[PDB]
Amino acid sequence: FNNSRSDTLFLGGEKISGDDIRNQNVLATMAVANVVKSSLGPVGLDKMLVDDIGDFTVTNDGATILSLLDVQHPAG
């Protein structure tokens, strides 16, 4: 799935470029959009966010959702 062991371009870490990285960024943005779409509009539905400790909160505020939404990707 992911590119590794390129056997070339010996840098301090791995390198991903081109269509692969473009698709990864697009998929990350699409995932964020799918997460946040349900809150659009006054007639929309809320969602529940859970922390790493065990607590959770429910809100339909897009700004709060995005602030508390943890996305581990530069596009996020």
Binding site: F10, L11, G12, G13, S17
Partner: protein, 521 residues
């Protein structure tokens, strides 16, 4: 027939190094031109950095292969000499490495390849120099126009009208007209939070980076004052053995103050004997520059004091003021002091900058200290970067007069002329020159690819138009096609292209000369 045995296999190592260098060059290639793609790198500390600067990208990539690191040195040399085009040199190096690999596949010895590439680079430099557009440093208007053109590509657009003449004057202050090599490091840029972009000063002398005496009695300025550089501190003696001040009643304050005042008064009398009215004391992390009692006594002596001066600032002051640092009060004399017409602090909100004018020192260099102001950090950073780029462009013009239109036109012209000339060459030299000319077309191809234009169409149109023009026809981002780049105000100094070609040739020669690697532990 019989030829060299070639028992060893240096070709494997050479090809591996070439492959690594070409991979790095291809990675850096896509950032060429104004429309270059941005590169994102996550550092070992987890920070995410996005930038289109070739040098920054190379630095953040953390190249591990010893040979691939040569591109970092090439970019550093380009910045030191040209100041721009770090991506162009890397792209040229990659193209020449590919050509060298193709030549090796043909059975040509690496030494032959290196020598032929050096000769071809020399010929290309001569060709490009022959076709350059001549410029003259005596034309201030031309320099201002060039600086404005260079600054037009930066964030600062409307303040270029003031930035360009500032850069022109600053460079002329140290370059005159026939100075040949001139070091732009003699121009010091100081950033300060506050004000706007228009609030900039050239100052033919030197500008400090700290405020004057903020306590009561501080002159804050002095006329007809001598300036000296101090590396020590005006403090009472501190014996290496146990020592401290213990006060249990106010009656001991008299003795303590008398002793401290006597010592600081001896120090201040030694300073005054040299007739020094401005004290520029280097910043220190151990003790303050001047004690409060010493400050009061100096105020009684009408001596200006500026403290918290960084080491770099002290060195620049010594270069520009013509004075020498004083290691200790014992070496404080008058022969090591300057003489400025007026040293004063500009009492204004957010600047509070002390400046020195009227140095009138023949032994001192004609240094320039530019003051950069800005309400936000972004404003000052952009202003400093744009001014530095303009100064570098003007310095490149000074070192080698001439302007070359951009957009890859000179590369295409050189490739065409080299292709025509190589027909008269014989042996491996002709083939290597042909390969060099073919590789020279990489830059216009990269520009076309980054601009979204058809590479074949762009190169064919450029070559067709070059039947009449030489360098004025190139790739223009504004027109999104092949046009007269000279009329579009897209030009670069001849020095930039010549240094790029020379650095590419030298890097190729260095890479080809590598045949083995061993560890030294």
């Amino acid at each position: 027939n019989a030829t060299f045995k070639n028992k060893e296999k240096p070709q494997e190592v050479r090809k591996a190094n070439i492959i690594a260098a070409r991979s790095v060059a291809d990675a850096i290639r896509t950032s060429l031109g104004p429309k270059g793609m941005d590169k994102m790198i996550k550092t070992s500390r987890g920070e995410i950095i996005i930038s289109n600067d070739g040098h920054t990208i190379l630095k953040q990539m953390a190249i591990l292969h010893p040979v691939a690191r040569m591109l970092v040195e090439v970019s550093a040399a380009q910045d030191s000499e040209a100041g721009d085009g770090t991506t162009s040199v890397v792209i040229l190096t990659g193209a020449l490495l590919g050509a060298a690999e193709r030549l090796l596949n043909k059975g040509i010895h690496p030494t032959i390849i290196a020598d032929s590439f050096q000769s071809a680079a020399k010929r290309s430099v001569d060709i490009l120099l022959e076709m350059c557009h001549k410029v003259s440093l005596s034309d201030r208007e031309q320099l201002v126009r060039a600086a404005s053109t260079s600054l037009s590509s930066k964030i600062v657009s409307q303040y270029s009208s003031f930035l360009a003449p500032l850069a022109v004057d600053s460079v002329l202050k140290i370059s005159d007209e026939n100075s040949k090599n001139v070091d732009l490091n003699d121009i010091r840029l100081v950033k300060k939070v506050g004000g706007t972009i228009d609030d900039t000063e050239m100052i033919d002398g030197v500008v400090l980076t700290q405020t004057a005496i903020k306590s009561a009695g501080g002159p804050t300025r002095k006329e007809k004052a001598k300036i000296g550089l101090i590396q020590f501190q005006i403090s009472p003696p501190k014996p290496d053995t146990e020592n401290n001040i213990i006060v249990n009643d106010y009656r001991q304050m008299d003795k303590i103050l008398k002793e401290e005042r006597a010592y600081l008064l001896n120090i201040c009398k030694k300073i005054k004997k040299a007739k020094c009215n401005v004290l520029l004391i280097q910043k220190s992390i151990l003790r303050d520059a001047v004690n409060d009692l010493a400050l009061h006594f100096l105020s009684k002596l009408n001596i200006m004091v500026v403290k918290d001066i960084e080491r770099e600032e002290i060195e620049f002051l010594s270069k520009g003021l013509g004075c020498k640092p004083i290691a200790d009060i014992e070496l404080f004399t008058e022969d090591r002091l300057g003489s400025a017409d007026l040293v004063e602090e500009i009492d204004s909100d957010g600047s509070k900058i002390v400046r020195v004018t009227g140095i009138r020192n023949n032994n001192a260099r004609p240094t320039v200290s530019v003051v950069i102001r800005g309400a936000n950090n972004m404003i000052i950073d952009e202003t400093e970067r744009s001014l530095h780029d303009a100064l570098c462009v003007i310095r490149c013009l000074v070192k080698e007069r001439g302007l070359i239109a951009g957009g890859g036109a000179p590369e295409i012209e050189i490739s065409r002329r080299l292709s025509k000339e190589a027909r008269s060459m014989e042996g491996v030299q002709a083939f290597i020159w042909q390969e060099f000319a073919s590789a020279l077309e990489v830059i216009p191809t990269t520009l076309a690819e980054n601009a979204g234009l058809n590479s074949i169409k762009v190169v064919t149109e450029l070559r067709s138009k070059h039947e009449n023009g030489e360098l004025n026809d190139g790739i223009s981002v504004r027109r999104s096609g092949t046009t007269n780049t000279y009329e579009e105000h897209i030009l670069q100094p001849v020095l930039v292209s010549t240094s790029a070609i020379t650095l590419a040739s030298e890097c190729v020669k260095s890479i080809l000369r590598i045949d083995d690697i061993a560890f030294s532990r």
